[PDB]
Amino acid sequence: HTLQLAIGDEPTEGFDPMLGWSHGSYLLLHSPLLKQNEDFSWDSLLLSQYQPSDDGKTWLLTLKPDLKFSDGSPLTAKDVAFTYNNAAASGGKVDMGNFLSAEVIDPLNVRIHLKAPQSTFVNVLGSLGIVSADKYNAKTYAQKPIGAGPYRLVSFQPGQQMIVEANPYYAGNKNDFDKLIFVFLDEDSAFAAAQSGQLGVVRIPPSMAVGSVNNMKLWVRPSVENRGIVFPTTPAGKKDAHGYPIGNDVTADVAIRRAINYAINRQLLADQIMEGHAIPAYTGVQGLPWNNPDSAIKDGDIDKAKQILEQAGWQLNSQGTREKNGLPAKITLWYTSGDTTRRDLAQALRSMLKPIGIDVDLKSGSWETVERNMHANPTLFGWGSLDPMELYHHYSSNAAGVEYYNPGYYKNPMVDKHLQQALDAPTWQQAVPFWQQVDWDGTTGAGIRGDAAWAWLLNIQHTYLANNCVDLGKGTPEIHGSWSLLNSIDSWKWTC
Numbered sequence: 290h291t292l293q294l295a296i297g298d299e300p301t302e303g304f305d306p307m308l309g310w311s312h313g314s315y316l317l318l319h320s321p322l323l324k325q326n327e328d329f330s331w332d333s334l335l336l337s338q339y340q341p342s343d344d345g346k347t348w349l350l351t352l353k354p355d356l357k358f359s360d361g362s363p364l365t366a367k368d369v370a371f372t373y374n375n376a377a378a379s380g381g382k383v384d385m386g387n388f389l390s391a392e393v394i395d396p397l398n399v400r401i402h403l404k405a406p407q408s409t410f411v412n413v414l415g416s417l418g419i420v421s422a423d424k425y426n427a428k429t430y431a432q433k434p435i436g437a438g439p440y441r442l443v444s445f446q447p448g449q450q451m452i453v454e455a456n457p458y459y460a461g462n463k464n465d466f467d468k469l470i471f472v473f474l475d476e477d478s479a480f481a482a483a484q485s486g487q488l489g490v491v492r493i494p495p496s497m498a499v500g501s502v503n504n505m506k507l508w509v510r511p512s513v514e515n516r517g518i519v520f521p522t523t524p525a526g527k528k529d530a531h532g533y534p535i536g537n538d539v540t541a542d543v544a545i546r547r548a549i550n551y552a553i554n555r556q557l558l559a560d561q562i563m564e565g566h567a568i569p570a571y572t573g574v575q576g577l578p579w580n581n582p583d584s585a586i587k588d589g590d591i592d593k594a595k596q597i598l599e600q601a602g603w604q605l606n607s608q609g610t611r612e613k614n615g616l617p618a619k620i621t622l623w624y625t626s627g628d629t630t631r632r633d634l635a636q637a638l639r640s641m642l643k644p645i646g647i648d649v650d651l652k653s654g655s656w657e658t659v660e661r662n663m664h665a666n667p668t669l670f671g672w673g674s675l676d677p678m679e680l681y682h683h684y685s686s687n688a689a690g691v692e693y694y695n696p697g698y699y700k701n702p703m704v705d706k707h708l709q710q711a712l713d714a715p716t717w718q719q720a721v722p723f724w725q726q727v728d729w730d731g732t733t734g735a736g737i738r739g740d741a742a743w744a745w746l747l748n749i750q751h752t753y754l755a756n757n758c759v760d761l762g763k764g765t766p767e768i769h770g771s772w773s774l775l776n777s778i779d780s781w782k783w784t785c
């Protein structure tokens with residue numbers, strides 16, 4: 290069967306695990322050693338056995354026999370070792386952490402050596418795609434790659450489409466669709482093509498998940514993708530390396546941040562903006578094992594927000610705005626244009642924070658424009674993944690100002706300690722208790738009970754429209770990024 294999908298952003302700069310697995314359409318053409326389960330354990334497509342040592346410093350990987358690539362070339366230990374070592378030394382992103390080396394014992398066994406225990410290396414094992422040691426070249430791979438994925442590339446028209454076909458050498462199960470065509474369209478054009486019957490699967494914003502489309506069915510997919518506001522946690526007066534202002538004199542007050550957290554009604558955000566297709570999120574890891582269980586509050590509480598503001602010395606002035614030492618609680622919320630739900634979320638927040646006396650300005654821009662103001666102003670972001678490293682990216686002092694990570698320049702030495710403890714655990718199960726202390730350790734934290742570096746809002750569920758004859762099956766909770774639906778691609782069925 291042939292299926293046409295418009296599910297997200299267009300892939301830019303190639304299909305090479307070596308250059309970066311950032312896009313997320315690699316799930317189509319590639320396959321890592323491990324695949325994550327719904328209980329956050331790990332299974333494997335390519336391995337019969339994978340055992341880390343008790344020290345957590347080394348991994349032993351036994352490959353399944355008779356594995357092949359999309360071109361029919363054999364998949365063995367040489368290719369795994371080549372993959373990991375080359376991605377390690379390439380220096381082009383690809384976080385390998387404490388990785389040292391991959392040694393080939395026999396055609397079916399690889400031994401991975403790490404500098405120190407790393408609880409997140411299991412995420413590397415579950416992300417980095419395997420390339421062919423012989424056939425890999427940085428020039429010809431990006432355009433026409435070979436992998437262990439369920440599909441192999443056939444055609445690619447930039448700005449137009451991308452055509453792939455089922456890989457006969459796939460080690461996993463086959464679905465009911467032998468050919469897939471992915472069209473690159475904006476959300477509205479995609480919806481139009483869905484209603485016209487041109488496409489079988491289309492991704493739509495939750496706002497549009499309303500009413501009935503002919504010969505189509507809505508699919509709500511569980512997701513850890515989120516929406517939240519990041520606060521500048523330091524006073525103003527400093528600039529970064531690129532001359533962008535850092536800090537906000539209003540939001541540097543922790544009371545402001547806690548009050549904003551308590552005044553917001555997350556359930557109303559879900560029901561009124563996301564059409565019920567979100568769940569309230571009080572953290573960046575909402576619903577995950579490493580989420581602090583006590584990190585939730587009873588929000589939409591105006592009187593408590595007012596009480597918090599009054600306790601810190603924020604009083605209404607003659608103009609009806611909170612003032613403290615002549616400084617009014619006037620803030621500007623920034624967000625990225627080109628997204629309707631973000632505009633609506635920002636507006637809704639502006640309306641939600643008014644009754645507690647906080648005046649919210651709105652400013653939308655391109656990411657290039659947002660980059661300049663995201664350190665000096667509260668900003669809308671979306672994140673979320675099955676990788677606990679998010680907590681690091683958000684709350685590590687070393688991540689402050691780096692790319693889009695930690696724009697509020699949050700620095701708490703104890704939180705850094707807990708993060709480092711989590712990283713240095715041999716297993717992720719042992720790391721989980723340390724990840725939770727990031728929120729609150731009983732003394733300090735980055736959560737609401739703590740410094741409240743964020744006003745986290747929602748975990749957004751992904752919405753699709755599929756033909757009535759198409760079953761999208763199930764998979765792990767989808768994440769922030771594009772082409773997340775692909776995580777379920779093996780389970781796809783044709784019911785007509």
Ligand SMILES: N[C@@H](Cc1c[nH]c[nH+]1)C(=O)O
Nearest residue numbers: 656669670671672693769
């Ligand atoms: N991932 C973050 C930041 C970002 C910048 N560019 C792409 N993403 C967001 O979507 O809000």
Ligand SMILES: N[C@@H](Cc1c[nH]c[nH+]1)C(=O)O
Nearest residue numbers: 298311312671769770771
């Ligand atoms: N690759 C982008 C995806 C994105 C589009 N818009 C926002 N985010 C990211 O990780 O943030």
Ligand code: NI
Nearest residue numbers: 671672769770
């Ligand atoms: Ni993003």
